[PDB]
mmCIF file of N, CA and C in Angstrom:
data_model
loop_
_atom_site.group_PDB
_atom_site.id
_atom_site.type_symbol
_atom_site.label_atom_id
_atom_site.label_comp_id
_atom_site.label_asym_id
_atom_site.label_seq_id
_atom_site.Cartn_x
_atom_site.Cartn_y
_atom_site.Cartn_z
ATOM 1 N N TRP A 1 157.501 -7.746 104.752
ATOM 2 C CA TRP A 1 157.875 -7.706 106.158
ATOM 3 C C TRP A 1 157.646 -6.303 106.701
ATOM 4 N N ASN A 2 157.414 -6.222 108.009
ATOM 5 C CA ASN A 2 157.179 -4.943 108.663
ATOM 6 C C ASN A 2 158.500 -4.285 109.044
ATOM 7 N N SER A 3 158.589 -2.979 108.805
ATOM 8 C CA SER A 3 159.775 -2.193 109.118
ATOM 9 C C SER A 3 159.433 -1.207 110.227
ATOM 10 N N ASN A 4 160.092 -1.355 111.377
ATOM 11 C CA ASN A 4 159.856 -0.482 112.519
ATOM 12 C C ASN A 4 160.920 0.592 112.688
ATOM 13 N N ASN A 5 162.103 0.411 112.099
ATOM 14 C CA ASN A 5 163.174 1.389 112.201
ATOM 15 C C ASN A 5 163.798 1.744 110.860
ATOM 16 N N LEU A 6 163.340 1.144 109.763
ATOM 17 C CA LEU A 6 163.902 1.409 108.445
ATOM 18 C C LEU A 6 163.203 2.572 107.746
ATOM 19 N N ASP A 7 161.870 2.582 107.759
ATOM 20 C CA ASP A 7 161.097 3.637 107.120
ATOM 21 C C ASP A 7 160.233 4.426 108.093
ATOM 22 N N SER A 8 160.236 4.075 109.377
ATOM 23 C CA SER A 8 159.434 4.779 110.375
ATOM 24 C C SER A 8 160.197 6.015 110.830
ATOM 25 N N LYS A 9 159.862 7.163 110.250
ATOM 26 C CA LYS A 9 160.503 8.426 110.582
ATOM 27 C C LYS A 9 159.585 9.274 111.455
ATOM 28 N N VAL A 10 160.200 10.119 112.284
ATOM 29 C CA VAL A 10 159.428 10.974 113.180
ATOM 30 C C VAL A 10 158.751 12.094 112.399
ATOM 31 N N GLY A 11 159.430 12.631 111.388
ATOM 32 C CA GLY A 11 158.881 13.720 110.604
ATOM 33 C C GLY A 11 158.051 13.261 109.424
ATOM 34 N N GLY A 12 157.308 12.171 109.600
ATOM 35 C CA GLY A 12 156.458 11.668 108.543
ATOM 36 C C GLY A 12 157.245 11.019 107.414
ATOM 37 N N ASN A 13 156.526 10.760 106.324
ATOM 38 C CA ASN A 13 157.101 10.143 105.134
ATOM 39 C C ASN A 13 156.462 10.768 103.906
ATOM 40 N N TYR A 14 157.281 11.400 103.066
ATOM 41 C CA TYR A 14 156.802 12.051 101.855
ATOM 42 C C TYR A 14 157.433 11.499 100.587
ATOM 43 N N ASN A 15 158.374 10.562 100.697
ATOM 44 C CA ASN A 15 159.029 9.995 99.525
ATOM 45 C C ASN A 15 158.235 8.864 98.885
ATOM 46 N N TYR A 16 157.192 8.367 99.547
ATOM 47 C CA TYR A 16 156.375 7.274 99.035
ATOM 48 C C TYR A 16 154.938 7.755 98.905
ATOM 49 N N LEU A 17 154.392 7.668 97.694
ATOM 50 C CA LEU A 17 153.028 8.084 97.411
ATOM 51 C C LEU A 17 152.316 6.990 96.628
ATOM 52 N N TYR A 18 150.986 7.003 96.699
ATOM 53 C CA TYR A 18 150.160 6.020 96.012
ATOM 54 C C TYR A 18 149.053 6.723 95.241
ATOM 55 N N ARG A 19 148.797 6.241 94.027
ATOM 56 C CA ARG A 19 147.775 6.822 93.167
ATOM 57 C C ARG A 19 146.390 6.387 93.630
ATOM 58 N N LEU A 20 145.486 7.348 93.768
ATOM 59 C CA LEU A 20 144.155 7.064 94.295
ATOM 60 C C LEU A 20 143.027 7.569 93.407
ATOM 61 N N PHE A 21 143.192 8.726 92.764
ATOM 62 C CA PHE A 21 142.094 9.375 92.061
ATOM 63 C C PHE A 21 142.256 9.416 90.548
ATOM 64 N N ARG A 22 143.439 9.116 90.017
ATOM 65 C CA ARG A 22 143.643 9.189 88.576
ATOM 66 C C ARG A 22 142.796 8.145 87.856
ATOM 67 N N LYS A 23 142.338 8.505 86.655
ATOM 68 C CA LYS A 23 141.488 7.609 85.879
ATOM 69 C C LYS A 23 142.293 6.555 85.131
ATOM 70 N N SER A 24 143.562 6.832 84.841
ATOM 71 C CA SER A 24 144.403 5.890 84.108
ATOM 72 C C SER A 24 144.740 4.704 85.004
ATOM 73 N N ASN A 25 144.220 3.529 84.657
ATOM 74 C CA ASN A 25 144.483 2.312 85.411
ATOM 75 C C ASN A 25 145.767 1.666 84.911
ATOM 76 N N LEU A 26 146.657 1.326 85.843
ATOM 77 C CA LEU A 26 147.941 0.725 85.499
ATOM 78 C C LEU A 26 147.730 -0.747 85.161
ATOM 79 N N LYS A 27 147.947 -1.101 83.897
ATOM 80 C CA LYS A 27 147.826 -2.483 83.475
ATOM 81 C C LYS A 27 149.026 -3.291 83.964
ATOM 82 N N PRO A 28 148.872 -4.610 84.097
ATOM 83 C CA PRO A 28 150.006 -5.441 84.518
ATOM 84 C C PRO A 28 151.157 -5.364 83.524
ATOM 85 N N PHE A 29 152.368 -5.591 84.040
ATOM 86 C CA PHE A 29 153.597 -5.536 83.245
ATOM 87 C C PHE A 29 153.775 -4.166 82.591
ATOM 88 N N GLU A 30 153.421 -3.114 83.325
ATOM 89 C CA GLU A 30 153.559 -1.746 82.848
ATOM 90 C C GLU A 30 154.068 -0.873 83.986
ATOM 91 N N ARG A 31 154.445 0.356 83.642
ATOM 92 C CA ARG A 31 154.956 1.305 84.622
ATOM 93 C C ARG A 31 154.667 2.719 84.142
ATOM 94 N N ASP A 32 154.294 3.588 85.079
ATOM 95 C CA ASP A 32 153.997 4.984 84.778
ATOM 96 C C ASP A 32 154.547 5.847 85.902
ATOM 97 N N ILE A 33 155.540 6.673 85.584
ATOM 98 C CA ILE A 33 156.180 7.540 86.562
ATOM 99 C C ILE A 33 155.739 8.993 86.388
ATOM 100 N N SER A 34 154.624 9.222 85.699
ATOM 101 C CA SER A 34 154.136 10.574 85.470
ATOM 102 C C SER A 34 153.421 11.093 86.711
ATOM 103 N N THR A 35 153.810 12.285 87.159
ATOM 104 C CA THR A 35 153.193 12.935 88.314
ATOM 105 C C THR A 35 152.291 14.045 87.782
ATOM 106 N N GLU A 36 151.013 13.725 87.619
ATOM 107 C CA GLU A 36 150.022 14.646 87.081
ATOM 108 C C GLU A 36 148.952 14.925 88.133
ATOM 109 N N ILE A 37 147.985 15.756 87.758
ATOM 110 C CA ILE A 37 146.878 16.137 88.626
ATOM 111 C C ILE A 37 145.590 15.580 88.037
ATOM 112 N N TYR A 38 144.737 15.036 88.902
ATOM 113 C CA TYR A 38 143.489 14.436 88.452
ATOM 114 C C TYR A 38 142.556 15.500 87.888
ATOM 115 N N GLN A 39 142.018 15.237 86.701
ATOM 116 C CA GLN A 39 141.088 16.140 86.037
ATOM 117 C C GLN A 39 139.660 15.688 86.308
ATOM 118 N N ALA A 40 138.839 16.603 86.814
ATOM 119 C CA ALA A 40 137.439 16.331 87.129
ATOM 120 C C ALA A 40 136.578 17.104 86.132
ATOM 121 N N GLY A 41 136.262 16.460 85.012
ATOM 122 C CA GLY A 41 135.443 17.078 83.988
ATOM 123 C C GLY A 41 136.123 18.240 83.295
ATOM 124 N N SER A 42 135.634 19.452 83.546
ATOM 125 C CA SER A 42 136.187 20.642 82.921
ATOM 126 C C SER A 42 137.468 21.073 83.634
ATOM 127 N N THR A 43 138.104 22.115 83.094
ATOM 128 C CA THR A 43 139.340 22.697 83.607
ATOM 129 C C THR A 43 140.422 21.634 83.786
ATOM 130 N N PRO A 44 140.993 21.110 82.696
ATOM 131 C CA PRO A 44 142.098 20.147 82.816
ATOM 132 C C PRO A 44 143.385 20.857 83.205
ATOM 133 N N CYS A 45 143.831 20.632 84.441
ATOM 134 C CA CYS A 45 145.016 21.318 84.948
ATOM 135 C C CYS A 45 146.289 20.510 84.707
ATOM 136 N N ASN A 46 146.382 19.324 85.314
ATOM 137 C CA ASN A 46 147.515 18.415 85.120
ATOM 138 C C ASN A 46 148.853 19.112 85.360
ATOM 139 N N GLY A 47 148.909 19.942 86.400
ATOM 140 C CA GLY A 47 150.137 20.640 86.737
ATOM 141 C C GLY A 47 149.924 22.079 87.155
ATOM 142 N N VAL A 48 148.754 22.626 86.830
ATOM 143 C CA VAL A 48 148.389 23.990 87.195
ATOM 144 C C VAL A 48 147.190 23.881 88.134
ATOM 145 N N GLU A 49 147.201 22.831 88.961
ATOM 146 C CA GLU A 49 146.104 22.441 89.844
ATOM 147 C C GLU A 49 145.445 23.614 90.560
ATOM 148 N N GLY A 50 144.142 23.496 90.796
ATOM 149 C CA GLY A 50 143.334 24.590 91.296
ATOM 150 C C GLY A 50 141.863 24.230 91.290
ATOM 151 N N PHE A 51 141.038 25.083 90.683
ATOM 152 C CA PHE A 51 139.608 24.822 90.574
ATOM 153 C C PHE A 51 139.347 23.457 89.952
ATOM 154 N N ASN A 52 138.728 22.571 90.736
ATOM 155 C CA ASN A 52 138.396 21.208 90.317
ATOM 156 C C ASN A 52 139.653 20.427 89.920
ATOM 157 N N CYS A 53 140.579 20.331 90.873
ATOM 158 C CA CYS A 53 141.798 19.550 90.709
ATOM 159 C C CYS A 53 142.147 18.910 92.044
ATOM 160 N N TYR A 54 142.467 17.618 92.018
ATOM 161 C CA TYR A 54 142.738 16.853 93.224
ATOM 162 C C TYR A 54 144.131 16.243 93.165
ATOM 163 N N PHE A 55 144.691 15.973 94.343
ATOM 164 C CA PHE A 55 146.004 15.354 94.463
ATOM 165 C C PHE A 55 145.848 13.847 94.628
ATOM 166 N N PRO A 56 146.098 13.061 93.579
ATOM 167 C CA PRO A 56 145.872 11.612 93.672
ATOM 168 C C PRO A 56 146.951 10.895 94.469
ATOM 169 N N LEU A 57 148.173 11.427 94.447
ATOM 170 C CA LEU A 57 149.306 10.807 95.134
ATOM 171 C C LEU A 57 149.246 11.182 96.612
ATOM 172 N N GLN A 58 148.349 10.513 97.330
ATOM 173 C CA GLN A 58 148.186 10.766 98.753
ATOM 174 C C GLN A 58 149.399 10.268 99.533
ATOM 175 N N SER A 59 149.660 10.917 100.662
ATOM 176 C CA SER A 59 150.794 10.573 101.505
ATOM 177 C C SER A 59 150.408 9.496 102.512
ATOM 178 N N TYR A 60 151.390 8.667 102.869
ATOM 179 C CA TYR A 60 151.153 7.594 103.829
ATOM 180 C C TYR A 60 151.156 8.122 105.260
ATOM 181 N N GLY A 61 152.264 8.730 105.678
ATOM 182 C CA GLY A 61 152.387 9.232 107.032
ATOM 183 C C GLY A 61 152.984 8.214 107.981
ATOM 184 N N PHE A 62 154.124 7.642 107.601
ATOM 185 C CA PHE A 62 154.772 6.625 108.419
ATOM 186 C C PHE A 62 155.371 7.262 109.668
ATOM 187 N N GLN A 63 154.886 6.844 110.838
ATOM 188 C CA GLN A 63 155.374 7.336 112.115
ATOM 189 C C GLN A 63 155.513 6.164 113.076
ATOM 190 N N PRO A 64 156.551 6.162 113.919
ATOM 191 C CA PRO A 64 156.731 5.049 114.865
ATOM 192 C C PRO A 64 155.738 5.054 116.016
ATOM 193 N N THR A 65 154.969 6.125 116.196
ATOM 194 C CA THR A 65 154.002 6.221 117.280
ATOM 195 C C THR A 65 152.598 5.802 116.861
ATOM 196 N N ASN A 66 152.434 5.275 115.651
ATOM 197 C CA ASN A 66 151.132 4.847 115.168
ATOM 198 C C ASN A 66 150.902 3.374 115.501
ATOM 199 N N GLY A 67 149.754 2.852 115.072
ATOM 200 C CA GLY A 67 149.412 1.468 115.312
ATOM 201 C C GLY A 67 150.076 0.523 114.330
ATOM 202 N N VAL A 68 149.709 -0.755 114.447
ATOM 203 C CA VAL A 68 150.287 -1.770 113.572
ATOM 204 C C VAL A 68 149.757 -1.626 112.149
ATOM 205 N N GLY A 69 148.554 -1.073 111.986
ATOM 206 C CA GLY A 69 147.984 -0.889 110.665
ATOM 207 C C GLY A 69 148.524 0.288 109.885
ATOM 208 N N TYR A 70 149.232 1.203 110.544
ATOM 209 C CA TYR A 70 149.789 2.379 109.891
ATOM 210 C C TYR A 70 151.301 2.312 109.731
ATOM 211 N N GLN A 71 151.948 1.280 110.265
ATOM 212 C CA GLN A 71 153.387 1.152 110.122
ATOM 213 C C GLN A 71 153.744 0.764 108.687
ATOM 214 N N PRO A 72 154.906 1.197 108.198
ATOM 215 C CA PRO A 72 155.293 0.853 106.824
ATOM 216 C C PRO A 72 155.625 -0.625 106.692
ATOM 217 N N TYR A 73 155.264 -1.192 105.542
ATOM 218 C CA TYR A 73 155.515 -2.598 105.241
ATOM 219 C C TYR A 73 156.295 -2.675 103.937
ATOM 220 N N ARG A 74 157.552 -3.102 104.022
ATOM 221 C CA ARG A 74 158.407 -3.227 102.847
ATOM 222 C C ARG A 74 157.985 -4.466 102.066
ATOM 223 N N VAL A 75 157.428 -4.254 100.877
ATOM 224 C CA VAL A 75 156.833 -5.312 100.067
ATOM 225 C C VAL A 75 157.702 -5.532 98.838
ATOM 226 N N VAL A 76 158.026 -6.794 98.560
ATOM 227 C CA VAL A 76 158.843 -7.172 97.411
ATOM 228 C C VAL A 76 158.111 -8.269 96.649
ATOM 229 N N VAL A 77 157.881 -8.045 95.358
ATOM 230 C CA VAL A 77 157.192 -8.996 94.490
ATOM 231 C C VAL A 77 158.227 -9.628 93.569
ATOM 232 N N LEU A 78 158.166 -10.951 93.428
ATOM 233 C CA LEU A 78 159.109 -11.710 92.609
ATOM 234 C C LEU A 78 158.332 -12.494 91.555
ATOM 235 N N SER A 79 158.358 -12.010 90.317
ATOM 236 C CA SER A 79 157.755 -12.696 89.184
ATOM 237 C C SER A 79 158.837 -13.344 88.326
ATOM 238 N N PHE A 80 158.428 -14.337 87.540
ATOM 239 C CA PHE A 80 159.367 -15.091 86.717
ATOM 240 C C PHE A 80 158.599 -15.824 85.624
ATOM 241 N N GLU A 81 159.309 -16.717 84.936
ATOM 242 C CA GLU A 81 158.723 -17.647 83.982
ATOM 243 C C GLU A 81 159.544 -18.931 84.009
ATOM 244 N N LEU A 82 158.974 -19.999 83.459
ATOM 245 C CA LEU A 82 159.556 -21.330 83.566
ATOM 246 C C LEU A 82 159.982 -21.854 82.199
ATOM 247 N N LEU A 83 160.692 -22.986 82.238
ATOM 248 C CA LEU A 83 161.100 -23.733 81.046
ATOM 249 C C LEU A 83 162.041 -22.928 80.152
ATOM 250 N N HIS A 84 162.889 -22.098 80.744
ATOM 251 C CA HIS A 84 163.840 -21.341 79.936
ATOM 252 C C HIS A 84 165.280 -21.460 80.416
ATOM 253 N N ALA A 85 165.512 -21.506 81.727
ATOM 254 C CA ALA A 85 166.866 -21.572 82.263
ATOM 255 C C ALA A 85 166.796 -21.987 83.724
ATOM 256 N N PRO A 86 167.796 -22.720 84.224
ATOM 257 C CA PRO A 86 167.780 -23.131 85.634
ATOM 258 C C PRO A 86 168.392 -22.095 86.565
ATOM 259 N N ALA A 87 168.476 -22.424 87.853
ATOM 260 C CA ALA A 87 169.039 -21.532 88.859
ATOM 261 C C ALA A 87 170.057 -22.316 89.684
ATOM 262 N N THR A 88 170.525 -21.705 90.774
ATOM 263 C CA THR A 88 171.545 -22.329 91.614
ATOM 264 C C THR A 88 170.934 -23.359 92.557
ATOM 265 N N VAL A 89 169.997 -22.925 93.406
ATOM 266 C CA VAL A 89 169.373 -23.830 94.370
ATOM 267 C C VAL A 89 168.418 -24.814 93.718
ATOM 268 N N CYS A 90 168.279 -24.765 92.391
ATOM 269 C CA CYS A 90 167.578 -25.819 91.668
ATOM 270 C C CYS A 90 168.163 -27.183 92.010
ATOM 271 N N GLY A 91 169.432 -27.387 91.677
ATOM 272 C CA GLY A 91 170.160 -28.562 92.081
ATOM 273 C C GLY A 91 171.535 -28.590 91.450
ATOM 274 N N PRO A 92 172.566 -28.881 92.244
ATOM 275 C CA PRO A 92 173.904 -29.031 91.662
ATOM 276 C C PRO A 92 173.979 -30.304 90.837
ATOM 277 N N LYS A 93 173.960 -30.160 89.513
ATOM 278 C CA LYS A 93 173.825 -31.313 88.628
ATOM 279 C C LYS A 93 174.500 -30.992 87.302
ATOM 280 N N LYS A 94 175.697 -31.532 87.102
ATOM 281 C CA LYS A 94 176.394 -31.423 85.831
ATOM 282 C C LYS A 94 176.124 -32.682 85.007
ATOM 283 N N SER A 95 176.839 -32.837 83.896
ATOM 284 C CA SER A 95 176.701 -34.038 83.084
ATOM 285 C C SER A 95 177.218 -35.248 83.853
ATOM 286 N N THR A 96 176.326 -36.203 84.120
ATOM 287 C CA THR A 96 176.695 -37.369 84.918
ATOM 288 C C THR A 96 177.518 -38.360 84.104
ATOM 289 N N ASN A 97 176.935 -38.900 83.038
ATOM 290 C CA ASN A 97 177.610 -39.873 82.188
ATOM 291 C C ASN A 97 176.814 -40.009 80.897
ATOM 292 N N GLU B 1 114.209 26.177 95.390
ATOM 293 C CA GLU B 1 113.955 27.197 96.400
ATOM 294 C C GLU B 1 115.073 27.278 97.431
ATOM 295 N N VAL B 2 115.871 26.218 97.576
ATOM 296 C CA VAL B 2 117.007 26.270 98.491
ATOM 297 C C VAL B 2 118.117 27.138 97.915
ATOM 298 N N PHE B 3 118.265 27.154 96.590
ATOM 299 C CA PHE B 3 119.285 27.968 95.936
ATOM 300 C C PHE B 3 118.745 29.349 95.571
ATOM 301 N N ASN B 4 117.643 29.391 94.824
ATOM 302 C CA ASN B 4 117.030 30.640 94.387
ATOM 303 C C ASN B 4 115.802 30.909 95.249
ATOM 304 N N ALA B 5 115.910 31.891 96.143
ATOM 305 C CA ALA B 5 114.816 32.269 97.026
ATOM 306 C C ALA B 5 114.839 33.781 97.215
ATOM 307 N N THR B 6 113.905 34.278 98.028
ATOM 308 C CA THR B 6 113.845 35.708 98.304
ATOM 309 C C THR B 6 114.855 36.127 99.365
ATOM 310 N N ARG B 7 115.161 35.244 100.313
ATOM 311 C CA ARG B 7 116.124 35.544 101.362
ATOM 312 C C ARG B 7 116.611 34.236 101.966
ATOM 313 N N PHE B 8 117.709 34.325 102.706
ATOM 314 C CA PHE B 8 118.332 33.179 103.352
ATOM 315 C C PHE B 8 118.294 33.357 104.867
ATOM 316 N N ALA B 9 118.924 32.421 105.569
ATOM 317 C CA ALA B 9 119.005 32.426 107.021
ATOM 318 C C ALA B 9 120.417 32.803 107.460
ATOM 319 N N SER B 10 120.639 32.761 108.770
ATOM 320 C CA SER B 10 121.926 33.111 109.349
ATOM 321 C C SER B 10 122.761 31.848 109.553
ATOM 322 N N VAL B 11 123.905 31.990 110.218
ATOM 323 C CA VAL B 11 124.762 30.840 110.482
ATOM 324 C C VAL B 11 124.438 30.183 111.822
ATOM 325 N N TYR B 12 123.899 30.940 112.781
ATOM 326 C CA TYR B 12 123.515 30.350 114.057
ATOM 327 C C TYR B 12 122.237 29.532 113.946
ATOM 328 N N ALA B 13 121.385 29.830 112.964
ATOM 329 C CA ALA B 13 120.168 29.058 112.699
ATOM 330 C C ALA B 13 120.006 28.991 111.182
ATOM 331 N N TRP B 14 120.544 27.934 110.583
ATOM 332 C CA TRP B 14 120.527 27.759 109.139
ATOM 333 C C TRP B 14 119.411 26.806 108.724
ATOM 334 N N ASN B 15 119.136 26.790 107.423
ATOM 335 C CA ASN B 15 118.096 25.934 106.873
ATOM 336 C C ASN B 15 118.626 24.519 106.680
ATOM 337 N N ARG B 16 117.861 23.535 107.144
ATOM 338 C CA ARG B 16 118.215 22.127 107.021
ATOM 339 C C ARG B 16 117.206 21.448 106.106
ATOM 340 N N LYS B 17 117.688 20.907 104.990
ATOM 341 C CA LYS B 17 116.845 20.255 103.999
ATOM 342 C C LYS B 17 117.308 18.821 103.791
ATOM 343 N N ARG B 18 116.351 17.899 103.748
ATOM 344 C CA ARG B 18 116.619 16.484 103.531
ATOM 345 C C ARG B 18 116.003 16.055 102.208
ATOM 346 N N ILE B 19 116.765 15.308 101.417
ATOM 347 C CA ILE B 19 116.318 14.814 100.120
ATOM 348 C C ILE B 19 115.964 13.342 100.299
ATOM 349 N N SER B 20 114.670 13.055 100.417
ATOM 350 C CA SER B 20 114.181 11.699 100.603
ATOM 351 C C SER B 20 113.055 11.420 99.618
ATOM 352 N N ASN B 21 112.995 10.170 99.153
ATOM 353 C CA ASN B 21 111.985 9.724 98.191
ATOM 354 C C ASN B 21 111.999 10.585 96.929
ATOM 355 N N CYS B 22 113.199 10.910 96.452
ATOM 356 C CA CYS B 22 113.371 11.732 95.263
ATOM 357 C C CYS B 22 114.566 11.212 94.473
ATOM 358 N N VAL B 23 114.819 11.845 93.331
ATOM 359 C CA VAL B 23 115.948 11.500 92.475
ATOM 360 C C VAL B 23 116.367 12.755 91.721
ATOM 361 N N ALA B 24 117.672 12.900 91.497
ATOM 362 C CA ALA B 24 118.202 14.084 90.839
ATOM 363 C C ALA B 24 119.446 13.707 90.050
ATOM 364 N N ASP B 25 119.947 14.674 89.281
ATOM 365 C CA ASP B 25 121.140 14.499 88.461
ATOM 366 C C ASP B 25 122.126 15.606 88.795
ATOM 367 N N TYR B 26 123.347 15.223 89.161
ATOM 368 C CA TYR B 26 124.394 16.173 89.504
ATOM 369 C C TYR B 26 125.169 16.666 88.287
ATOM 370 N N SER B 27 124.700 16.358 87.077
ATOM 371 C CA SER B 27 125.383 16.818 85.873
ATOM 372 C C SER B 27 125.057 18.269 85.550
ATOM 373 N N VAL B 28 123.853 18.728 85.893
ATOM 374 C CA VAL B 28 123.485 20.112 85.616
ATOM 375 C C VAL B 28 124.131 21.061 86.622
ATOM 376 N N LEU B 29 124.427 20.582 87.831
ATOM 377 C CA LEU B 29 125.049 21.414 88.852
ATOM 378 C C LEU B 29 126.533 21.654 88.607
ATOM 379 N N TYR B 30 127.128 20.996 87.613
ATOM 380 C CA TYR B 30 128.549 21.149 87.329
ATOM 381 C C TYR B 30 128.833 22.027 86.120
ATOM 382 N N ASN B 31 127.966 22.010 85.107
ATOM 383 C CA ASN B 31 128.155 22.797 83.895
ATOM 384 C C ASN B 31 127.361 24.099 83.919
ATOM 385 N N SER B 32 127.164 24.682 85.104
ATOM 386 C CA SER B 32 126.420 25.930 85.204
ATOM 387 C C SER B 32 127.266 27.134 84.809
ATOM 388 N N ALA B 33 128.585 27.054 85.001
ATOM 389 C CA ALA B 33 129.511 28.135 84.657
ATOM 390 C C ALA B 33 129.140 29.435 85.369
ATOM 391 N N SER B 34 128.649 29.313 86.603
ATOM 392 C CA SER B 34 128.261 30.471 87.396
ATOM 393 C C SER B 34 128.771 30.435 88.829
ATOM 394 N N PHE B 35 129.412 29.354 89.261
ATOM 395 C CA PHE B 35 129.921 29.247 90.619
ATOM 396 C C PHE B 35 131.342 29.789 90.702
ATOM 397 N N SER B 36 131.656 30.410 91.840
ATOM 398 C CA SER B 36 132.992 30.957 92.050
ATOM 399 C C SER B 36 133.972 29.866 92.471
ATOM 400 N N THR B 37 133.686 29.195 93.584
ATOM 401 C CA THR B 37 134.515 28.110 94.085
ATOM 402 C C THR B 37 133.689 26.833 94.168
ATOM 403 N N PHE B 38 134.348 25.700 93.927
ATOM 404 C CA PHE B 38 133.690 24.397 93.941
ATOM 405 C C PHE B 38 134.668 23.368 94.488
ATOM 406 N N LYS B 39 134.455 22.951 95.733
ATOM 407 C CA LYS B 39 135.248 21.909 96.371
ATOM 408 C C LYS B 39 134.327 20.761 96.756
ATOM 409 N N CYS B 40 134.758 19.531 96.474
ATOM 410 C CA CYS B 40 133.943 18.344 96.751
ATOM 411 C C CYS B 40 134.881 17.242 97.244
ATOM 412 N N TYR B 41 135.001 17.124 98.562
ATOM 413 C CA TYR B 41 135.866 16.129 99.175
ATOM 414 C C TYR B 41 135.121 14.811 99.366
ATOM 415 N N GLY B 42 135.894 13.740 99.537
ATOM 416 C CA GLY B 42 135.362 12.417 99.769
ATOM 417 C C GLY B 42 135.041 11.628 98.514
ATOM 418 N N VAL B 43 134.731 12.310 97.411
ATOM 419 C CA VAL B 43 134.382 11.642 96.162
ATOM 420 C C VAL B 43 134.695 12.597 95.019
ATOM 421 N N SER B 44 134.915 12.039 93.832
ATOM 422 C CA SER B 44 135.203 12.864 92.670
ATOM 423 C C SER B 44 133.944 13.609 92.229
ATOM 424 N N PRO B 45 134.075 14.859 91.775
ATOM 425 C CA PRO B 45 132.884 15.613 91.353
ATOM 426 C C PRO B 45 132.223 15.060 90.103
ATOM 427 N N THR B 46 132.920 14.241 89.318
ATOM 428 C CA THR B 46 132.372 13.680 88.091
ATOM 429 C C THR B 46 132.055 12.195 88.201
ATOM 430 N N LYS B 47 132.354 11.565 89.333
ATOM 431 C CA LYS B 47 132.097 10.143 89.536
ATOM 432 C C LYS B 47 131.331 9.917 90.831
ATOM 433 N N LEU B 48 130.359 10.784 91.112
ATOM 434 C CA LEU B 48 129.487 10.634 92.267
ATOM 435 C C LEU B 48 128.047 10.325 91.882
#
């Protein structure tokens, strides 16, 4: 869903970043919270960024004065599996007889 | 000749060179170990 007053701040947005240049591809069902610097061939910096070092965690820039394509969108993904346990809205059904 | 020449031009009238109907490798331009600063925006210097 689109958020017009929840994440749309006047002074930009710096708490949300996205990986763009790192070579390590995030496989499904995994997580990586490492904040490193992209290495381009020689001079591996990974924290001492400089000559031939790029910032992969680019900023979004959420502002309420931008267009519909630049507004923040709060995204929630719901994964699961089946044939293991029921839920509530499944159906109210106890032992009948 | 664009890099190694006898003299260069100014900033108000600089040299304009177009690379057409040719092919080159950007691997030798990176391991020269002779450049002071190297910035390459828009694409990675090792994946272009």
